Amino acid sequence: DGVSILQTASSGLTSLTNSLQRIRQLAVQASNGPLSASDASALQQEVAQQISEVNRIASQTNYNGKNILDGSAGTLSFQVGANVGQTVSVDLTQSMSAAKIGGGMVQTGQTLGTIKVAIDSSGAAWSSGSTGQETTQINVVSDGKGGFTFTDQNNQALSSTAVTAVFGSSTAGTGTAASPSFQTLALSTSATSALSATDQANATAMVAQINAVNKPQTVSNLDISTQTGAYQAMVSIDNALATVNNLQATLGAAQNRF
């Protein structure tokens, strides 16, 4: 009973790992350099096939005809001993369907993008009047709570004055796994006003990238046919794999108690 149900669930999770790991490699392939329309279409077709397999695993993994990986099994309990209350409980309340895994917040420490800028150490636009060192790039790094930390072209943290002066005062994430939430990256006009029109446009596009990568789709809605979509897929799959690994670990802990 309990041991066999746990094995059936764990088998399904291993199938799911295979398909998620496959989407990761496809996303890597799609993000390495420029792609023709035909190559982008072909790569996304492969992702769609894997999404279909994820949905099959979620809708069809079953024990004696009863689904166990679509959330519908709930919490199961098994008697292991003679003590009243000597039971092992197994939480199968979370669906593994593509619509219900991935998404969420980017894990901490990931570089979301790099913006070319022209500012002084206080975050003011660089000019012939400026002194000290010029900041020429800003790397935007996730904090695991839907917000950001920032380094310069030499990987040194921006001063707190420069962070505030360029990005405003809502950069720190406040989300939790239980209640996710997302900051909106906003770049000052002063960060790029000294640069060419083309550099200003490039920065705007990078900020849009970063904001999209910060809010990845669930596995169901991944599309790797654009660079931003491929980057969103990498984050989303990292998160989906973490969800699957957490669940595998809990199944294992339950098996151990039998």
Residue numbers in the entry: 69 to 326
List sentences from the manuscript.
To date, one of the main candidate antigens is bacterial flagellin (FliC), which assembles to form the flagellar filament that supports bacterial motility. Interestingly, FliC is recognized as a pathogen associated molecular pattern (PAMP) by Toll-like receptor 5 (TLR5) and by nucleotide-binding oligomerization domain (NOD)-like receptor C4 (NLRC4), activating both innate and adaptive immunity. Flagellins vary in dimension (28–65 kDa) and contain at least two essential highly conserved domains, D0 and D1 that mediate assembly of the flagellar filament, and may contain a second (D2) or third (D3) variable domain. FliCBp constitutes a major target for vaccine discovery initiatives to elicit protective immunity against B. pseudomallei infections.
We also report the 1.3Å resolution FliCBp crystal structure as the basis for in silico epitope predictions using two diverse computational methods. FliCBp (residues 25 to 378) was crystallized using the sitting drop vapor diffusion method, as described in the Materials and Methods section. Electron density was visible for residues 69–326; the first 44 N-terminal residues and the 52 C-terminal residues were absent, however experimental epitope mapping revealed two immunocaptured peptides containing N-terminal residue 37 and residue 361, therefore the residues that are not visible in the electron density are likely to be present in disordered regions of the protein. Typically, removal of the D0 domain is necessary for successful crystallization. This was not the case for FliCBp where, however, the first 44 N-terminal residues (corresponding to the D0 domain) are not visible in the electron density map because of structural disorder. Overall, FliCBp adopts the canonical flagellin fold and presents two domains, a conserved D1 domain (residues 69–167, 287–326), and a variable D2 domain (168 and 286). D1 forms a helical rod (α1, α2 and α5) involving residues contributed by both the N-terminus (residues 69–170) and C-terminus (residues 285–326), a β-hairpin domain (β1-β2) and a 310 α-helix (η1). Domain D2 (residues 172–287) contains a three-stranded antiparallel β-sheet, two α−helices (α3 and α4) and two 310 α-helices (η2 and η3). Domain D2 is connected to D1 via two anti-parallel regions that house two short 310 α-helices (η1 and η3) that interact with each other, thus stabilizing the relative positions of the two domains. F96-111 is housed in domain D1 and is composed of two short α-helical segments at the C- and N- termini of α-helices 1 and 2, connected by a short loop. The third predicted peptide F270-288, is located in domain D2 and is formed by α-helix 4, the 310 α-helices η3, and their connecting loop region.
